[PDB]
């Protein structure tokens, strides 16, 4: 049982993050995951300061 | 050339008491059958093989003469049983085979050799009919343990849990059962690992969907 | 991006330049041609230096140096070979224990080109270790691996061409038609015009680029050029080189 449920949410998960990455301050950047977001090429990328 | 081969060719009653006197023996680890066919020669006929031996040494490559010796090996078979000292490791030269005789009265090695997936419970069923005290359980305990990762099958499994001795110490499959019940237990921990990873992975592309619809 | 932004004989070794002279207002005592070694601190009208017909020069290191005469006799002295002749002065490639020539080309691991009785001067010249048709780059660090450019495909007498090789793009003079194209992308980076006879152009051996000329002597400086390469680099199958890079950025390199 454990097995049949995951190869199913595997391969839901999968597709889903395959086509949310699809689907899309457009440049490609990785944006803060508590509520930020910036371009990367806009020199947000590598700001050093011990990060 | 080849007619001297034919003719050396062209020239089984104490090979039944030797194949008895063999089976009499039921250790576990004992010589090979092989071993034990080249023990009985050597305590005793195999001069003119070695006469054809030494023909057939020179055949390294003669295929053709090979498979004519095997033909005519067949065709002056004693017992079928005088083959194996003219094919001594020539088994393919004329496997689901051997075991009509190699595991005929004993042959842990054969039984090795030509051990599987399927026809699996069938050997034990047949070691089963040793019927010693505790010879036969040590057999079977051996037996098992020097396969043990050739059964990988449930419905195997079960099978072979079912035909366990009923009249066995539970000390002598005591080791046997532990490791199976461990090495369910270890597969049921990394299914439960993996599919908690697998939530994980889920879990971490919702949050992902949640800051993209944050994102506008 | 990448930012850029711009008489007998001139050289430049290491933060100086060469009869007035530059230190970074003297004048030394008063030529034909001249030839400066890898030291920061050479023969004239007499036909001699006091301390031949060689249409060759390029120091081997920072003291020796390379000749030999267009009717091939090379010393280094040390002499390489001697065959054939030639109606005017090339490919006098040499380092990194190899030799590289440029109309026929051995194979020296320890082919034609237009030319005329004034042919090219410097078409074969690269640092940090030609023809009408086409150009063709080659670096040691090969024939197979060569590769080859067609000049029809280049941008614009008729543009009298003048070599800079630098490490990310290669330079041209071609009179006034001074163009940079990157050394592996097979594109032209951008292109310049020189105002008037032109000397010559020269790089500093030590990363930058200036050009004598009898009316003014100018420069060529360049920037931002590893930033640019740096998404290049990474979308190619080389990652040694790309690695080795430096002065980009933490994350960039992280990723």
Known sequence: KLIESYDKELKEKNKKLKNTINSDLDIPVVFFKCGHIYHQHCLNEEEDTLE | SKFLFNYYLAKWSILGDFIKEYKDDFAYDKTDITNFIHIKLKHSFSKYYEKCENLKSENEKDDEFINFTFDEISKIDKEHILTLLFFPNELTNWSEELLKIYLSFNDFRSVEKYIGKQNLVAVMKQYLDISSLNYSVELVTNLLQRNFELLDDTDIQLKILETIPSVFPVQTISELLLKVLIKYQEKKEESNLRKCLLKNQISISDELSRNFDSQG | ?255
């Open chain 3, 1 to 255: 991006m990448i930012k850029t932004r711009i008489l007998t004989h001139l050289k430049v070794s290491n933060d100086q330049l060469i009869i007035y002279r530059i230190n970074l207002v003297n004048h030394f005592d008063c030529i034909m041609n001249v030839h400066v070694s890898p030291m920061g601190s050479i023969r004239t009208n007499f036909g001699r230096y006091m301390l031949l017909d060689l249409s060759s020069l390029h120091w081997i290191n920072e003291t020796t140096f390379l000749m030999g005469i267009k009717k091939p006799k090379l010393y280094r002295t040390k002499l390489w070979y001697e065959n054939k002749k030639l109606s005017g002065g090339d490919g006098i490639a040499y380092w990194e224990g190899s030799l590289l020539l440029t109309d026929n080309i051995l194979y020296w691991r320890d082919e034609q080109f237009e030319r005329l009785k004034h042919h090219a001067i410097k078409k074969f010249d690269s640092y940090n270790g030609v023809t009408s048709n086409g150009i063709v780059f080659g670096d040691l660090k090969f024939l197979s691996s060569s590769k080859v450019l067609l000049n029809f495909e280049l941008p614009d007498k008729d543009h009298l061409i003048k070599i800079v090789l630098t490490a990310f793009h290669i330079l041209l003079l071609r009179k006034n038609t001074v163009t940079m194209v990157s050394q592996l992308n097979n594109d032209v980076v951008f292109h310049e015009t020189i105002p008037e006879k032109f000397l010559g152009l020269v790089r500093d051996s030590v990363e930058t680029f200036w050009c004598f000329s009898n009316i003014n002597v100018f420069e060529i400086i360049i920037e931002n050029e590893p930033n640019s390469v740096w998404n290049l680099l990474v979308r190619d199958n080389k990652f040694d080189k790309a690695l080795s890079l430096k002065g980009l950025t933490v994350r960039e390199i992280e990723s």
